[PDB]
C-alpha cells in the first residue's frame with residue numbers, strides 16, 4: 001500500500017513551520033526551463049493523478065505510519081499530524097488541491113508553464129509543495145516522449161528523402177528497453193511514453209499502463225513480431241548455427257521473423273548461411289513475412305553498411321523511384337545495439353551517403369530510449385511563484401546571481417496563443433487583462449477528483465509531427 | 471495485479487518454439503562483464519525474488535489475460551498456453567526454477583558469475599530465459615550500490631587525509647534523488663541501494679522497501695534533518711530573505727538545520743546576512759545542532775570554495791592536527807547541486823588544495839546518484855551457458871567476431887576463492903573437480919520459495935570498505 005504521507009522528500013515534512021505566519025495560499029508551477037530539444041511533449045501527468053493523487057489518499061492508518069517513521073527518521077517529532085488529520089476529517093482524505101495543465105500530447109516550446117498547483121483550503125497552504133516530489137517525476141514520461149519524438153523527426157526526414165513517403169515510419173523505432181530500465185514501474189511509464197510516437201514495442205508493461213489509464217480504440221497500442229535471441233541460436237551448439245536458423249524460419253514461415261545473426265560471425269552468417277546455404281528458404285517468403293536479419297555487435301554504422309553490402313550481393317536489389325537501393329521485400333534488417341538519438345542520426349546519414357534506402361532498416365533501442373535520460377535534459381522543474389500571506393498576494397521567485405538560467409517565473413501564470421499562433425506564458429497575473437485571449441490550461445484535478453483526461457488516441461493526435469499533419 | 475506472463479520482452483513469448491527439439495535444461499547466468507568500477511556490490515535480487523517471483527504467480531485468469539493480449543500484440547496465436555497451464559496444474563502456479571546467488575552485499579570483481587538460473591522440470595526449459603528481463607533489472611540496484619560505494623571511497627580517502635579519521639563518513643553523501651528518478655518504484659530500489667553504503671537519505675521510499683524486504687535491527691536504515699527549500703525562503707518576498715532565515719533557524723534552534731542560501735545572492739547571504747546581521751543566532755548554536763549553509767547554483771567547486779572563504783573570514787576558523795582549516799562546529803556546508811562521482815572528486819580535491827578539511831562539508835546527490843546510470847556502466851548481462859538436449863549436456867556461448875568484449879562464459883559455473891583470497895569463476899563444470907574449495911553461490915530460490923535471505927545489516931557488513939574494516 002502506497003502512502004502519500006511517505007512519498008515526499010524528507011525535508012518537506014518540516015516546511016509547514018517555515019512559511020511566513022498566516023500564509024493561506026501557495027501556488028506553484030512546472031516548466032521545462034529554457035537553457036536541441038526546443039519543444040517538449042507533455043505526457044504522463046494523467047497517470048500520476050489517477051494512480052497516486054485521486055480519491056481517499058489519507059487514512060488514520062497512514063497518518064500513524066508516517067508519524068512512527070518520521071519520529072525515527074528525524075530522531076525527533078517534527079511531523080505535521082494536525083495538518084493531515086484536518087484533511088482526513090474535513091475532506092474524507094481527499095486532497096484540497098487544484099491542478100491546471102496543458103492537454104496531454106501537446107507539443108510546447110521550452111520555458112512555458114505546463115501545469116500549476118495550488119491549495120483550495122487556507123489550512124493546507126503546506127500541501128502544494130508537499131506533492132512537488134511526486135509531480136516532478138512527470139519529467140520522465142515527458143522526456144521519453146520528447147526524445148522519442150525527436151528520433152521520429154530524424155527517421156521521417158531520411159525516410160522521406162530516400163523513399164518519397166513515410167510508409168512504415170511508426171514501426172521504425174522499436175522499444176527494446178524492458179531489461180535496461182531501473183524498475184517494472186519505470187518500464188511501463190517509459191514504454192507508454194514511447195508509444196505516444198511509435199507503435200512498436202517489446203516492453204509489454206506499457207500496454208497495461210495505457211489500457212488502464214488512457215485507453216485506445218484499438219485492442220492494443222503497440223505490436224511486435226516473433227524473433228530469436230542469442231540463447232535460441234547458441235543452444236544448438238557452435239557447429240549448428242545453420243540448423244538453428246533453418247529451424248526458426250521454418251517454425252515462423254508465414255509471419256515476419258527476426259533472427260539475430262552475430263553469435264559467432266555476422267559476416268559469415270549473412271554471406272554463407274543466409275546468402276547461400278539457406279537462401280532458398282528466404283527468397284520463397286512473403287512480402288508480409290520477411291526475414292529480418294539482426295546484427296548486434298561492432299560499430300553500429302560500419303556493421304549496418306557491411307551487412308547491407310553483403311546482402312546486396314547475394315539477393316536481388318532494386319532501385320526505388322528516388323534512386324536508392326532496396327532489398328527485396330522478403331528481407332530486412334534491424335539494428336538493435338548501441339542505438340540512441342545520436343547513433344540513429346549517424347546510421348541513417350551513413351546509409352543515405354551509400355545510397356541505401358531507410359526502407360531497408362528498423363531500429364531497436366533499449367537503454368538509450370528509456371534509461372539514459374535525466375531531469376537535466378529538459379530542465380523539468382517545479383517552483384513556487386505566488387503566495388498569499390495576511391490576505392495579500394505576493395509574486396515570488398528565485399533569481400540566483402551566478403546562474404540566470406535558474407531564474408523562475410513570478411506570480412500567477414497562464415498559457416496563451418500569440419497573434420502569430422505561438423505559445424506564450426503570461427506572468428504576474430497578466431492573463432487577467434484578457435489582451436491575449438483565454439488561458440489554454442485546463443483544470444485536470446480538483447479536491448481529490450480528476451476533472452479532465454485524455455485518451456491515448458487523442459494524445460497521439462496531439463503529438464503528431466508537422467510532416468505527418470502534412 | 472502484476473502478471474509475470476506479461477513481464478517479459480515480447481519476443482521471448484516465441485522462444486519456446488526455437489530451442490533445439492528435445493531440450494530439457496536451459497541454464498543461464500548473470501555477470502557484470504569485464505572490458506574504473508573494477509568491483510561491484512551485489513544487491514537487489516532479494517527484492518525481486520520476493521516481490522515478483524515467489525509463491526503462486528500463475529493463475530487461470532493470468533493465463534487468459536496473457537493469451538488475449540498476445541493475440542492482439544502479435545496479431546497471431548504464438549503464446550505457449552500449454553506450458554503455463556502445466557506450471558499451474560503441476561506446481562500450483564509456482565515457478566519450477568532454481569536460482570543460486572552470491573550473498574547480498576558481497577563485493578565481487580568484474581567478470582564473475584553473480585547468480586545462475588535453471589529450470590527444475592524438463593517441461594519448463596523455456597522458463598529460464600522467460601524471466602531474464604525481470605532478473606536483469608537487478609543491474610539497477612547493483613549499479614547504484616556500486617557507484618555509491620565508489621563515492622564513499624573517494625570521501626574516505628580525502629576525509630582521512632584532511633582530518634585523520636573517518637568520523638561522519640556515513641553521513642557525507644545524502645540521497646536527494648526522489649524527484650529526479652523515473653518512478654516511485656525506482657525511487658525505493660535506488661534509495662535502498664545507496665543506504666547499503668550511507669545512512670543519509672531524503673528518499674523516504676527506500677525506508678519502506680528495506681523494512682519490508684530486508685530488515686534492520688535499528689528502527690530505520692536512514693536519517694535526515696530539517697531543512698529549507700527555495701519556496702520557504704522566497705515565500706517571504708525578495709526584500710525579506712533575512713526575515714526568512716531568522717524565522718527558520720529560530721524554529722529549529724536546537725536541532726541541525728540546513729538553509730538554502732542562494733535564492734538571490736549566495737555571496738551576500740553568507741557575508742552580510744549570516745556573517746553579520748544574523749551572526750548572533752549562529753555562534754550561539756550547539757555542536758549537535760549546527761546551521762548547514764546550502765549553496766545551490768554556480769560552478770560547484772568554485773562556489774564551495776568561495777562560500778568557505780567568505781565564512782572563514784566572518785567566523786572563527788581553527789587549524790586541525792593535519793594542518794587543514796575547520797569551520798566552528800556550529801557551522802557546516804552542504805553542496806547539493808550538480809554532484810556526481812566526477813564532480814564529487816573535483817570538489818574534495820579542490821578543497822584539499824585550498825587547505826580546507828573535508829570535515830566542513832557534506833554532499834547531496836540526486837540525479838547523479840540514482841538516475842544517471844545505465845546497464846552499460848558495469849555491463850550487467852544475462853546469458854545461457856549450458857543446455858541439455860537429448861540427455862547430453864552442451865556448453866554454449868556467444869563469441870561475436872567483431873567484439874571479444876561480448877564473449878560469454880561456457881558451461882556450468884561456480885564462484886570460488888583463490889589461494890590468494892581473490893575470486894575466480896570456474897567454467898565448464900570444473901568446480902566439480904573440487905580443487906578450489908566450496909562454491910560461493912547459494913540456493914536463494916527454488917520451486918517458488920525463497921530459500922535463503924539476508925538482513926540489511928548483513929548486507930551492509932558485506933559491503934564495508936577495506937579502510938573501515
Ligand SMILES: CC(C)CN1CCC([S@](=O)c2ccc(CNC(=O)c3cc4ccncc4o3)cc2)CC1
Nearest residue numbers: 171174176202224225227256258292334362479481
Ligand atoms: C509487417 C512487418 C513486416 C513490419 N515490420 C516492422 C519493423 C519490425 S522491426 O524489424 C522488429 C524486429 C524484431 C522485433 C522483435 N523483438 C526483438 O527482436 C528484440 C527485442 C529485444 C529486447 C532486448 N534486446 C534485444 C531484443 O530483440 C521487433 C521489431 C519488424 C516488422
Ligand SMILES: CC(C)CN1CCC([S@](=O)c2ccc(CNC(=O)c3cc4ccncc4o3)cc2)CC1
Nearest residue numbers: 009011641644646672694695697726728762804832
Ligand atoms: C548530527 C548532524 C550535525 C549531522 N549532519 C550530517 C550531514 C547532514 S547534510 O548536511 C544534510 C543537510 C540537509 C538535509 C536535508 N535535506 C535537504 O536539505 C534537501 C533534500 C533535497 C532534495 C532535493 N533537492 C534538494 C534537497 O535538499 C540532509 C542532509 C546534516 C546533519
